[PDB]
Short mmCIF file of C-alpha atoms in Angstrom, two decimals:
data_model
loop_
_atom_site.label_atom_id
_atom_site.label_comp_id
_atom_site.label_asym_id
_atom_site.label_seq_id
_atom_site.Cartn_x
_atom_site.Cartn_y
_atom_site.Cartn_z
CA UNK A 1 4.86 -18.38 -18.38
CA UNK A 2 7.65 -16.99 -16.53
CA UNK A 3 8.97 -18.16 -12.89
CA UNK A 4 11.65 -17.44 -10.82
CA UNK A 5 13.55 -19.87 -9.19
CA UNK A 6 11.61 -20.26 -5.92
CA UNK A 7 9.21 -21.87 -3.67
CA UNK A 8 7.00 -18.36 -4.05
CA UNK A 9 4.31 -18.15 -6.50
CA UNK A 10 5.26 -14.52 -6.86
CA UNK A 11 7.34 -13.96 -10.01
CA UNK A 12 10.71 -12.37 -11.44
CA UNK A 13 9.28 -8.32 -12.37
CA UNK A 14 9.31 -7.89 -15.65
CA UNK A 15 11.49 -5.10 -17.23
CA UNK A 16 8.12 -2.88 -17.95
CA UNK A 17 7.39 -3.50 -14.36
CA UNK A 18 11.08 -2.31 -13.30
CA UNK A 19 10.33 1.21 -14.94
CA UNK A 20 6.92 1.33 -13.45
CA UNK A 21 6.05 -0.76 -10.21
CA UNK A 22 3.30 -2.79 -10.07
CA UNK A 23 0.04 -1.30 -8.29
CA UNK A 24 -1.67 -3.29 -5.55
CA UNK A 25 -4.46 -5.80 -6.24
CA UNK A 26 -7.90 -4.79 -7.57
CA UNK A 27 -10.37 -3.86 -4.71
CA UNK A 28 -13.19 -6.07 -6.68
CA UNK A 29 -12.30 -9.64 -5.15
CA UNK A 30 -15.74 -10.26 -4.01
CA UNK A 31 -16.45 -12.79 -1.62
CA UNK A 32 -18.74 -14.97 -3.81
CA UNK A 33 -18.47 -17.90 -6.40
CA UNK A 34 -16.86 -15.63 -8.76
CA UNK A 35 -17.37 -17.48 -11.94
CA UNK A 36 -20.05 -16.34 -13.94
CA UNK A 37 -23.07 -16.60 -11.48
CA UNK A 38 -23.93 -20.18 -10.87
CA UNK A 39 -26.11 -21.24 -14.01
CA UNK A 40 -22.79 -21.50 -15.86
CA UNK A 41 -20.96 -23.38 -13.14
CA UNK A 42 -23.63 -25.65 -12.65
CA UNK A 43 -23.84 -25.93 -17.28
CA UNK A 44 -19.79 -27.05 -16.57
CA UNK A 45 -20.74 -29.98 -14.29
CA UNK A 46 -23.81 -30.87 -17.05
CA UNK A 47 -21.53 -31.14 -20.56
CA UNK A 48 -19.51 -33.98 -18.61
CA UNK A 49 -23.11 -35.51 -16.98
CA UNK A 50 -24.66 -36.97 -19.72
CA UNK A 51 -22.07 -37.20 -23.20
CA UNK A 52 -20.05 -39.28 -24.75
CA UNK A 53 -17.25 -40.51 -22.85
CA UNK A 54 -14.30 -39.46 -25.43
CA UNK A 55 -15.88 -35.62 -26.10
CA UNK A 56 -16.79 -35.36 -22.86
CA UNK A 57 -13.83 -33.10 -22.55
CA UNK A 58 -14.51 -31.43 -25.79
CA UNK A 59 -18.32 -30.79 -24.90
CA UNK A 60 -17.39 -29.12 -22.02
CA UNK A 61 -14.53 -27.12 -24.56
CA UNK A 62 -16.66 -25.66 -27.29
CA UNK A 63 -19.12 -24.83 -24.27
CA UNK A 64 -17.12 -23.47 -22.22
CA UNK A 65 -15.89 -21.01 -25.29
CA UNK A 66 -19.66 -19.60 -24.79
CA UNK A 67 -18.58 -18.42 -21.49
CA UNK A 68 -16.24 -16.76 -22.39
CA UNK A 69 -18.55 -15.20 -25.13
CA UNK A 70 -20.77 -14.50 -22.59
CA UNK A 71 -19.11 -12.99 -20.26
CA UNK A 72 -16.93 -10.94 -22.82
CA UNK A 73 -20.38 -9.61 -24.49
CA UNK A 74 -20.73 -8.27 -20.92
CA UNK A 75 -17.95 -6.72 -21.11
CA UNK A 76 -18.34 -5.17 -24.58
CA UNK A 77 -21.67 -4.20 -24.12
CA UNK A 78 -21.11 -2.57 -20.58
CA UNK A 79 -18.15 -0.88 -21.28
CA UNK A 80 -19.69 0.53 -24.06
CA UNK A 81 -21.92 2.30 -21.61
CA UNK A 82 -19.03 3.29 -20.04
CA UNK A 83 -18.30 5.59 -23.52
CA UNK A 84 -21.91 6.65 -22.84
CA UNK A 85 -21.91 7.90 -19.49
CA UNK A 86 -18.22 9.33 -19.87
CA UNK A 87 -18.82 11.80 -22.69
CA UNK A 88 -22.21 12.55 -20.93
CA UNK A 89 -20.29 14.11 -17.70
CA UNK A 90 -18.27 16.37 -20.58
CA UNK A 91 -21.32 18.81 -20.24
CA UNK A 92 -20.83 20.03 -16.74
CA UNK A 93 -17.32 20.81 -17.54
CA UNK A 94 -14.87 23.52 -19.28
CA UNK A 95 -14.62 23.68 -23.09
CA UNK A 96 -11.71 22.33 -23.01
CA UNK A 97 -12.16 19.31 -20.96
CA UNK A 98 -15.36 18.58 -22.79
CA UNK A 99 -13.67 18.20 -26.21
CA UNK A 100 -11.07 15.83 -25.26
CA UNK A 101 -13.58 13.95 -23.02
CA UNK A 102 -16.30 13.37 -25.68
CA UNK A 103 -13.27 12.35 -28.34
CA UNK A 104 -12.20 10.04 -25.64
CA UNK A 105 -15.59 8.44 -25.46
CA UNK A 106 -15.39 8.31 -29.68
CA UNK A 107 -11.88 6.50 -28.68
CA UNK A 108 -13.53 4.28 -26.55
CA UNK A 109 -16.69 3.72 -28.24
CA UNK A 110 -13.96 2.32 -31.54
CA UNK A 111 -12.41 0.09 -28.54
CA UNK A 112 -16.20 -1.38 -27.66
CA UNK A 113 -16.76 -2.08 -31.44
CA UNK A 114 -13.98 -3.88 -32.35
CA UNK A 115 -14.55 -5.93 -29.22
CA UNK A 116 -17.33 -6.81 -30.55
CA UNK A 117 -16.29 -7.75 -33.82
CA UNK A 118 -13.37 -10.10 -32.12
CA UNK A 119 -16.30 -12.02 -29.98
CA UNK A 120 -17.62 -12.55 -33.43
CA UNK A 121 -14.76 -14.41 -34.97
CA UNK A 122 -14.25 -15.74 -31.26
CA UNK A 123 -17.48 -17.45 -32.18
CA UNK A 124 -16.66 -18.66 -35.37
CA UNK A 125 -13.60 -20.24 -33.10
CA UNK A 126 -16.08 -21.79 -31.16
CA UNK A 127 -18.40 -23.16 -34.20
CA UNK A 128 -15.59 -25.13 -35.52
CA UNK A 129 -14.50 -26.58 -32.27
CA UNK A 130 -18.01 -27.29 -32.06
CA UNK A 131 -17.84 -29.15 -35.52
CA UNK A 132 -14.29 -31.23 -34.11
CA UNK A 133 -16.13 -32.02 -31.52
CA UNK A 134 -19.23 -33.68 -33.44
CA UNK A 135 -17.39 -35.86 -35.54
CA UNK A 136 -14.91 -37.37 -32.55
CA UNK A 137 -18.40 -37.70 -30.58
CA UNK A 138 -19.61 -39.78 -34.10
CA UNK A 139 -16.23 -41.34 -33.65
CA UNK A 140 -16.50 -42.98 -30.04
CA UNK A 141 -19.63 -45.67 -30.83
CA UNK A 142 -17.28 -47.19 -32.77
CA UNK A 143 -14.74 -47.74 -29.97
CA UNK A 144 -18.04 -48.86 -27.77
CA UNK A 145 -18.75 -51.67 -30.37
CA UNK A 146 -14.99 -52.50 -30.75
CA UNK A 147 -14.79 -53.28 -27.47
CA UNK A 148 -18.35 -54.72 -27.09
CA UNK A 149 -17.30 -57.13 -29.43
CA UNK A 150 -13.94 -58.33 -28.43
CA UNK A 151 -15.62 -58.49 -25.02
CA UNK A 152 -18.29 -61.14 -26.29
CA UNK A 153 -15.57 -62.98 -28.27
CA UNK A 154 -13.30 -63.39 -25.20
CA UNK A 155 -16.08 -64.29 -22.99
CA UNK A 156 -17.28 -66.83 -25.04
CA UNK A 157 -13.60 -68.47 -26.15
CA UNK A 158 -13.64 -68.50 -21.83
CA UNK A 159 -16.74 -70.46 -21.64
CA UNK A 160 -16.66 -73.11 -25.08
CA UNK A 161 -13.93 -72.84 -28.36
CA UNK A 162 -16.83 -74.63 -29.89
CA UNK A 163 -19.80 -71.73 -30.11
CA UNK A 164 -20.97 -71.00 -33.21
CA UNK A 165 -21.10 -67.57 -32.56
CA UNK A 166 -16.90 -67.18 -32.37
CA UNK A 167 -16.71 -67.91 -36.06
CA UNK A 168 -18.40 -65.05 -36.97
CA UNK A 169 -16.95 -62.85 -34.00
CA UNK A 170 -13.71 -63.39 -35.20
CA UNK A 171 -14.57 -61.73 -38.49
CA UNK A 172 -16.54 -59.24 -36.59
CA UNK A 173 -13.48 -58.00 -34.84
CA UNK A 174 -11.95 -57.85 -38.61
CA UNK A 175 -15.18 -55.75 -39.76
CA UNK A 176 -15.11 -53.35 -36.90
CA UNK A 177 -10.91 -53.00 -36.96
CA UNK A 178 -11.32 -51.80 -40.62
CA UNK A 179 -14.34 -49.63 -39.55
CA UNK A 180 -12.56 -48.21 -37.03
CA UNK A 181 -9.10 -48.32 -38.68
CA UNK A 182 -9.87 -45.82 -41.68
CA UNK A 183 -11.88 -42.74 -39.43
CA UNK A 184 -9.63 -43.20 -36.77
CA UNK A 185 -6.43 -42.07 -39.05
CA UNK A 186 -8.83 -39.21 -40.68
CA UNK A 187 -9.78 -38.16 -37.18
CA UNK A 188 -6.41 -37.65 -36.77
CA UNK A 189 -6.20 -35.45 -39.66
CA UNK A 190 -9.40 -33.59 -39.37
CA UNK A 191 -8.53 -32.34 -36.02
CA UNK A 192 -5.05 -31.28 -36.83
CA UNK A 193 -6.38 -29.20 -39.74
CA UNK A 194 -9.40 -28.06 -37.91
CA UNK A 195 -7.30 -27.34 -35.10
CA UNK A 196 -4.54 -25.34 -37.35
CA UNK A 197 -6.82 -23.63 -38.91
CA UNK A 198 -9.22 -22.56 -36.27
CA UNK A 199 -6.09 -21.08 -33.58
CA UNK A 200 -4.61 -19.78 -36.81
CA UNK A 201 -7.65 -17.47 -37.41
CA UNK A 202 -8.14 -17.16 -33.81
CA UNK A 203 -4.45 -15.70 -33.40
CA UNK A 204 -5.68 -13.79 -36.63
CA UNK A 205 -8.47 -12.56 -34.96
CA UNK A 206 -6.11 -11.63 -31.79
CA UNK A 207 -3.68 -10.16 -33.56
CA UNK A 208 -6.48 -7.87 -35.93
CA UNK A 209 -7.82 -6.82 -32.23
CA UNK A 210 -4.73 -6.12 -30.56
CA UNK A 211 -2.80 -3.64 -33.16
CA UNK A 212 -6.62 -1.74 -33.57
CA UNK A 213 -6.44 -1.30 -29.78
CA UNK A 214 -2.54 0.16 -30.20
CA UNK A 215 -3.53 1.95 -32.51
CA UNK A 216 -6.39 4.12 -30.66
CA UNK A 217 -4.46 3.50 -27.92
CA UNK A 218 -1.54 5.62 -28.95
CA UNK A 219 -3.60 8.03 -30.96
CA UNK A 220 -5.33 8.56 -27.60
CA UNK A 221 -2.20 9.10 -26.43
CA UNK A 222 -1.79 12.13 -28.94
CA UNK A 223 -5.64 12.89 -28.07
CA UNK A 224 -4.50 14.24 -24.57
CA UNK A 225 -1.81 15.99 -26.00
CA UNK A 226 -4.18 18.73 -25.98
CA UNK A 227 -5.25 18.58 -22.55
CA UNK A 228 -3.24 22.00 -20.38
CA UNK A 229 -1.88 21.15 -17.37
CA UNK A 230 -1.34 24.18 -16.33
CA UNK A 231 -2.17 25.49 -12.23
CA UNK A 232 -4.15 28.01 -13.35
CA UNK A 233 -4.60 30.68 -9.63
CA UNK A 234 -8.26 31.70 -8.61
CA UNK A 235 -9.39 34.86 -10.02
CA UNK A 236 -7.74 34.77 -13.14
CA UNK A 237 -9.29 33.87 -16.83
CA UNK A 238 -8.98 31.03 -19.02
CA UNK A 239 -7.84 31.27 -22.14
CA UNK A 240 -10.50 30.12 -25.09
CA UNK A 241 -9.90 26.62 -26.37
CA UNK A 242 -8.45 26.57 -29.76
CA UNK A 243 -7.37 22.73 -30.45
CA UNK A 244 -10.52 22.04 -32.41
CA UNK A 245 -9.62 21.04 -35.54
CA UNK A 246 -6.59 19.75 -33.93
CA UNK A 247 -8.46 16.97 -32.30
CA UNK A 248 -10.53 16.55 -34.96
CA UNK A 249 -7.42 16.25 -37.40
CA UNK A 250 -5.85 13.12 -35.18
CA UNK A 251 -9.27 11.02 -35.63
CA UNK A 252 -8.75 11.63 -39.51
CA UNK A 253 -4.99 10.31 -38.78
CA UNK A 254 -6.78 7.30 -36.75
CA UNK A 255 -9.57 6.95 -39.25
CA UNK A 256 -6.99 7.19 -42.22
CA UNK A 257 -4.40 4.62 -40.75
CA UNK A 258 -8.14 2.45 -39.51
CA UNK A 259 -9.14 2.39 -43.52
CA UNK A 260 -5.89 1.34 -44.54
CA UNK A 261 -4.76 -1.96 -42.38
CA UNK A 262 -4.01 -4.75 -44.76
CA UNK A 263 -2.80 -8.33 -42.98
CA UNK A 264 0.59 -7.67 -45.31
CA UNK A 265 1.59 -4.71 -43.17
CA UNK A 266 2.58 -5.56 -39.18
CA UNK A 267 4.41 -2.43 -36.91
CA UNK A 268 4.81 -5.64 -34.68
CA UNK A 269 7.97 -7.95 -35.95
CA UNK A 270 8.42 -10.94 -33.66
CA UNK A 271 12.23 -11.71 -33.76
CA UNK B 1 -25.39 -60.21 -39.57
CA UNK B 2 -24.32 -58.73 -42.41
CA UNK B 3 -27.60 -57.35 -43.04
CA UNK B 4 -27.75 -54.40 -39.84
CA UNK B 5 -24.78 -52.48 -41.87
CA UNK B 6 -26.78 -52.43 -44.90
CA UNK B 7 -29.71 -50.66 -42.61
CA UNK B 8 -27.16 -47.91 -41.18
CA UNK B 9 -25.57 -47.48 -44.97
CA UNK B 10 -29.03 -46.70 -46.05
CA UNK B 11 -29.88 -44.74 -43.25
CA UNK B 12 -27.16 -42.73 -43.47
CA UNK B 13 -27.36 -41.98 -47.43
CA UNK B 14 -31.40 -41.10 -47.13
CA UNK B 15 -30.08 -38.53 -43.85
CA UNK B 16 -27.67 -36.78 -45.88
CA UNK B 17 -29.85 -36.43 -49.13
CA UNK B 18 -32.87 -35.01 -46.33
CA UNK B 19 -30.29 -32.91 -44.96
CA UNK B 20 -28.84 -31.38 -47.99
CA UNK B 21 -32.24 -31.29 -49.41
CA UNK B 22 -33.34 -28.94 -46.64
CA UNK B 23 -30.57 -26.74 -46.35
CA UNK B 24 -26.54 -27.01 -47.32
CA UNK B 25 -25.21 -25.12 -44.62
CA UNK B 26 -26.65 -27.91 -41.82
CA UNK B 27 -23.60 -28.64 -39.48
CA UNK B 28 -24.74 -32.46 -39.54
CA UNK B 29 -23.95 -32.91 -43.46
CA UNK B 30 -20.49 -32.16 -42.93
CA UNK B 31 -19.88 -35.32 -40.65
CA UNK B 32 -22.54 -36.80 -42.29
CA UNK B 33 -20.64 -37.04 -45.71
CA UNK B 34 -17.93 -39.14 -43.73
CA UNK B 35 -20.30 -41.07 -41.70
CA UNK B 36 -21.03 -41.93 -45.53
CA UNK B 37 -16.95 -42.81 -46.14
CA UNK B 38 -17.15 -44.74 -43.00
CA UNK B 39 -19.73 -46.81 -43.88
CA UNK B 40 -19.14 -47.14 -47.26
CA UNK B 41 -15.26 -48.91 -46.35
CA UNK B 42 -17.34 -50.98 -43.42
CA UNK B 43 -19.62 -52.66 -45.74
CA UNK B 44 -17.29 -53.07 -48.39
CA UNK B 45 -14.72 -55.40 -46.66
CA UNK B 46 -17.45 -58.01 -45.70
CA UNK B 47 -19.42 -57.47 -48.64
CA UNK B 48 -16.22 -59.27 -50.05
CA UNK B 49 -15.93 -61.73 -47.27
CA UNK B 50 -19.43 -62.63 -47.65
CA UNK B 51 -19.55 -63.24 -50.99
CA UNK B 52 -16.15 -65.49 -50.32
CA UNK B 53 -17.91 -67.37 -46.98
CA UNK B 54 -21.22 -68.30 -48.94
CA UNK B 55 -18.50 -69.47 -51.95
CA UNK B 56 -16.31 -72.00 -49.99
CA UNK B 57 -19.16 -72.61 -47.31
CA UNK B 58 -22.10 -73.66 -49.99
CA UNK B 59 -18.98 -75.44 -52.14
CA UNK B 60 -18.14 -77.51 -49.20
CA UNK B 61 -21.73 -77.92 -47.63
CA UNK B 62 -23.10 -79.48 -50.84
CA UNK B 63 -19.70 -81.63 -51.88
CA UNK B 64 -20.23 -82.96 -48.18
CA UNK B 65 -24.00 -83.22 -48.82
CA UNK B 66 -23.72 -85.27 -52.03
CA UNK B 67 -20.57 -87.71 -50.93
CA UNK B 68 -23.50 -88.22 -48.01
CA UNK C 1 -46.24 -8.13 -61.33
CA UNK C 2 -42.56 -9.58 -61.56
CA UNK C 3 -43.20 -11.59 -58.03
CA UNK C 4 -45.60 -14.56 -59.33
CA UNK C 5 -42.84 -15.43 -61.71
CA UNK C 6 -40.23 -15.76 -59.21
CA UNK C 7 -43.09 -17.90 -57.20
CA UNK C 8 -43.13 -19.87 -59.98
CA UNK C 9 -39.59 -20.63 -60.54
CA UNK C 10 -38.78 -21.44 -56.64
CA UNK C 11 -42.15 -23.68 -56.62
CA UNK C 12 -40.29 -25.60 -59.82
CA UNK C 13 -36.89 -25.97 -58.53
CA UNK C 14 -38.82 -27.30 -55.40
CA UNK C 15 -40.51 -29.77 -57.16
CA UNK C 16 -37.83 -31.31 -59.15
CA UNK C 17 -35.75 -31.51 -55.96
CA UNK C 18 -38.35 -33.27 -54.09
CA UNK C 19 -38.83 -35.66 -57.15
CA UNK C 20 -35.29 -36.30 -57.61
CA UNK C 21 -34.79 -36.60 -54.06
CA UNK C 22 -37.58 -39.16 -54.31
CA UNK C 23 -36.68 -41.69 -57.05
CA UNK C 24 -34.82 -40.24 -60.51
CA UNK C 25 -37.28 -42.69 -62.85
CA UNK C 26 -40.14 -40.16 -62.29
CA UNK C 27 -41.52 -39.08 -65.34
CA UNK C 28 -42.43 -35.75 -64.54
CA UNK C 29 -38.51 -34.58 -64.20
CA UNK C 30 -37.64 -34.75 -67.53
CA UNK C 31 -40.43 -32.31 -68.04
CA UNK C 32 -39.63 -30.31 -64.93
CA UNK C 33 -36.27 -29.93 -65.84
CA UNK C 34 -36.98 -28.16 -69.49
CA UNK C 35 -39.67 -26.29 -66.76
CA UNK C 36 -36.90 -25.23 -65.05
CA UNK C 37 -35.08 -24.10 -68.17
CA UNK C 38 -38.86 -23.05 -69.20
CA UNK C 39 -39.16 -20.56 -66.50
CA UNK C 40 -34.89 -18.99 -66.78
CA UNK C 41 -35.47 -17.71 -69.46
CA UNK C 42 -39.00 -16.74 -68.72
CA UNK C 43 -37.78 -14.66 -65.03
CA UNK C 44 -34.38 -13.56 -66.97
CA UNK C 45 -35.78 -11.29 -70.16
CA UNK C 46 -37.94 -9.04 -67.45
CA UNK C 47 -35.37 -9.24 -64.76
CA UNK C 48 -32.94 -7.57 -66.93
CA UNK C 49 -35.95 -4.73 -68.00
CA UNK C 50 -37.12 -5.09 -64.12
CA UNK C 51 -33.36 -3.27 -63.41
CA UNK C 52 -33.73 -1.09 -66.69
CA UNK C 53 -37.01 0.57 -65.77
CA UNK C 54 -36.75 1.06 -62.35
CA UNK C 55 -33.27 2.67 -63.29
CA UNK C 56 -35.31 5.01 -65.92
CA UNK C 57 -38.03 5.09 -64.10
CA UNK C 58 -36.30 6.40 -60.92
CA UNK C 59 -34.27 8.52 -62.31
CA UNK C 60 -36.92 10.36 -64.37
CA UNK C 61 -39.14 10.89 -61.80
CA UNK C 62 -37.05 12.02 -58.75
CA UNK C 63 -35.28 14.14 -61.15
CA UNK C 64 -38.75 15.59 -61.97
CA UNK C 65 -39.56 15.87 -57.96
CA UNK C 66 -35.82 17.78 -57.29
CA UNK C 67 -36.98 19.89 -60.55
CA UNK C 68 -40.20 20.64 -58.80
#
């Protein structure tokens, strides 16, 4: 992140924020738990209750990828109400303000699906964390018989070097450092492909969901264009709304430039 | 002691074949293949070693039990 | 009357995975496996009609129901 060089947690404004100040903090900090009601807190405490020691942290990851599923599906699916109710309230309204407010809710209903489509691939994020996770879960009663057995053998070299049962411990500790030898160096390479791979789509993902939201985001932008201003005085008529097919030309823009985004063409160039 | 791997090799070859019998896209076949790997290098070294032991250890036991 | 054949052929490539799954010495999966060829070539020459007379068939009489 970025920090300024001081005791306060408040940080250095950034240059956007220099043109445009910061506005206070959201009125919504209820006084509650605040984390997804309490059946998901209470899931958190559960993946690390009763799993394996080593993916106990991972059991808790993968999971705790579903609330952020869940709570984003929330999001996409109440927002999209949002579009609902929005071009609803265009009826009781001037011509004018009810064509740019029901091509706003189009705008916004676009924003709700590809939401949706990005907690889809978020899943498929999830599924192959889920996968990492099962094979270093497979991986750890290995390292619970590995050091089950050099417990025994050092126990027993403690009480007598003549047991019969250290001759074959020996070569036990042999059979179980092979075992454990060959999946520990592919677990190693399983989760650094798995790992590469999965953030790699899941930037992929990002990236697919961010430039759509630019996109209607600027075209919106144009959208309002065609919104007058103007401080029209009491007793005097409106003129009739003409930007019709105007409107209806810059979703054609948005639809043509939604049809035709290929992964080899990126408006944003990291330097 | 030799003889428990054998039981998880097997176990492990007749749960992938049930797996992949009932459907390909099960999530367990794909660390079930490697549970299959793993195995396969754990009984293999002391398959080796235990055909060496039971060499040298029957060679010796019965040259020791005849010079008795 | 194309469905019983496509029964058929699921029921045999059942079978001969259950068998094979099973133990490969059974003697009925050397038969089931010409069954299986058996029944491709059975479900593929009406398949291939199946597509050409619904395509006719569809054509000729929703052209008949625009005509009337």
């Amino acid at each position: 992140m970025h920090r300024t060089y001081s005791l306060r947690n408040q940080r250095a404004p950034t240059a956007a924020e220099l043109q445009a100040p910061p506005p206070p903090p959201s009125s919504t900090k209820s006084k509650f738990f605040g984390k997804a009601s309490i059946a998901s807190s209470f899931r958190k405490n559960a993946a690390g209750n009763f799993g394996p020691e080593l993916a106990r942290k991972l059991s808790q990851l993968v999971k705790t990828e579903k609330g952020v599923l869940r709570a984003m599906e929330v999001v996409a699916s109440e927002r999209r109400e949002a579009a609902k109710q929005l071009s609803l309230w265009g009826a009781d309204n001037d011509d004018d303000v009810s064509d740019v407010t029901d091509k706003l809710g189009v705008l916004i209903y676009e924003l709700g699906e590809l939401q949706d489509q990005f907690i889809d691939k978020y899943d498929q994020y999830r599924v192959t964390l889920k996968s990492i996770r099962n094979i270093e879960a497979s991986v750890q009663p290995s390292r619970d018989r590995k050091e089950k057995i050099t417990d025994e053998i050092a126990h027993l070299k403690y009480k007598d070097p003549q047991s019969t049962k250290i001759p074959v411990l020996e070569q036990e500790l042999v059979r179980a450092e092979a075992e454990s030898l060959v999946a520990e160096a592919q677990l190693s390479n399983i989760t650094r492909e798995k790992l590469k791979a999965a953030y790699s789509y899941m930037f992929d993902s990002l990236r697919e969901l961010s430039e759509k939201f630019a996109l209607i985001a600027g075209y919106g932008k144009a959208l309002l264009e065609l919104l007058d201003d103007s401080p029209v005085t009491p007793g005097e008529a409106r003129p009739a709304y003409d930007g019709y097919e105007a409107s209806r030309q810059i979703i054609m823009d948005a639809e043509s430039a939604l049809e035709s985004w290929t992964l080899d063409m990126a408006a944003v160039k990291p330097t």
